[PDB]
Structure formats: structure tokens, C-alpha cells
Amino acid sequence: DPDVLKVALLPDENASELIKRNQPLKDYLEEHLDKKVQLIVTTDYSSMIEAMRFGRIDLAYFGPLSYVMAKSKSDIEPFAAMVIDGKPTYRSVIIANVASGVNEYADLKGKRMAYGDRASTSSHLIPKTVLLETADLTGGQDYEQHFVGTHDAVAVNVANGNADAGGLSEVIFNHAAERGLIDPSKVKVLGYSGEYPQYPWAMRSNLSPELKTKVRDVFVGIDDPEVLRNFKAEAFAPITDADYDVIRNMGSLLGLDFA
Asked: How would DSSP label each residue in 45-57?
């Protein structure tokens, strides 16, 4: 068991700043754990992942895709994840242009599909998975696929008729009309993806169970906005490794290499 907990944050080029910025986390953790903390910020994901693998980071904060890579190479466990919009998970919604006569995923056969950014989960990878798993529809092959830039652009492109359907974040679609981006009488929801996970905090499994248990309780109980605002989080809530299978499965289905 390390005398001082090595708590790594997201990788960053300005390590001194991000460490200073997150002093409220250091102070919150020392007081609540009764243990000294050393904050760590790595130049890239490979450094972080390998340093944890070899016992030189104790707790670490990852992106979900990054977490899945870290887990394949080392005995770690997630114990909390970022809460935003009331939970540590989110969905994608598929919407359809009302006038296009698309009533079901299957009807996207030979139609136009709007996606956000090639790299987005909520506006590309997730909605693409849904179409494949549910209707055996492959992008490029069984429908025409347009990448239009952002989540707002998906909603707009579907609503104004330039696509028949599109996939975006549930959360963002839910205020697209509120913000006046679209007429809500021109689109309807076809359905939702499963729940995908947010940024996990993860720890090395061979820390003592006394420490591990206490770590998890402390992080889950953080209510200090000065700590939380740096993660753009309302809270941290329990999460487990099993909550990232839906990402593993998405990798496979689409043939993604996370590096």
C-alpha cells in the first residue's frame, strides 16, 4: 500500500497548470482520506496507462475509450464516474424527418443518414451501431451517410429535409427545439441506444480493500463544487467495469482500433 496516493488526471501539455487548477481535489482528498496525495498529469494516454500498469499511478481519471485500453493492459477497477444530466451514463437518439415516411430503423434502406463528427460516440459510432445491430444496415453500403459536423447540425439537417434521419445525443436533441434550432413538428424519435458510460475514475486492484473501499466512498460523496467544476460534473456516482462492455461491443461490431 503506497504511503502517498498517486492520483492522475486527464493527460495534458500544461501539467503545472492543471495540477494547480486541481488543488481543491488534492485538499479535499487529503482531509477526507487522511492520507497524502500527489497529483499527476501525463503528456499522453500511453504514459498514463503504462505507469498505472506498473504501479506508478494509484487512482486515475480516464476517458471511456482510454479506460477500456487501460483495463486490457492492467488489473484496475473503475469505482466512480462523472455525473452530468443526473447520471454517469448517456444515450443517443435516432430521429427521423416526419415527411420522409420513415417509421422504423429498417426504412433507412437506401435513405440519407446524418451523423455529427466521425469521432463522436453519441453522434456517430453509437447511432451507427444501433442501425447495424437492429436492422443490419451498414453505413456507406445500405444507406447514404452524411457527416455534418455537430450534434446541432444533425437535428437541423434532419428537420430541414436534407437527411431522412440522424443520430445525436439525447440530451442535445431535447433542447434543440427549445433553442429554436428546429421546428419540433418536423421530426420524430425512432428510438434510443443503450446507456453508454461517462469518464471513470479507476484504481489499481492490488491496493488494500480498506483503502479501496474508503477511496470509493470518498469520491462518490464529493459535493464540493470547487472540486467538481474542474470535471464539469454535478457529482461522481458508482460505476463498474461491466458498464463499459457496451463500448467493447461497439469497438468489435464496427472494427474500431481505440489507438
From this structure: HHHHHHHHHTTS-
Residue 184: give its domain's CATH number.
Answer: 3.40.190.10
Q: Is 21 exposed, middle or buried (0-12, 13-18, 19+ CB in 10 A)?
A: middle
- The span from the CA of 180 to the CA of 259, in Å, is 38
- Cβ atoms 158, 144 nearer than 8 A: no
The residue range of the domain holding 176 is 89-196
| Experimental technique used to determine this entry | X-ray
Residue 259: CB atoms within 10 A of its CB come to 8
CA distance 236 to 228: 8
Helix (H) or strand (E) holding 27: helix 23-33
Residue 202 and residue 183: Cα distance in Å, rounded?
42
What are 99's three cell numbers?
415527411
Beta bridge partners of 122: none
Angle between helix axes 64-73 and 245-254 (nearest 10 degrees) is 90
Question: Is 161 in contact with 88 (CB distance < 8 Å)?
Answer: no
Resolution reading in Å: 2.1
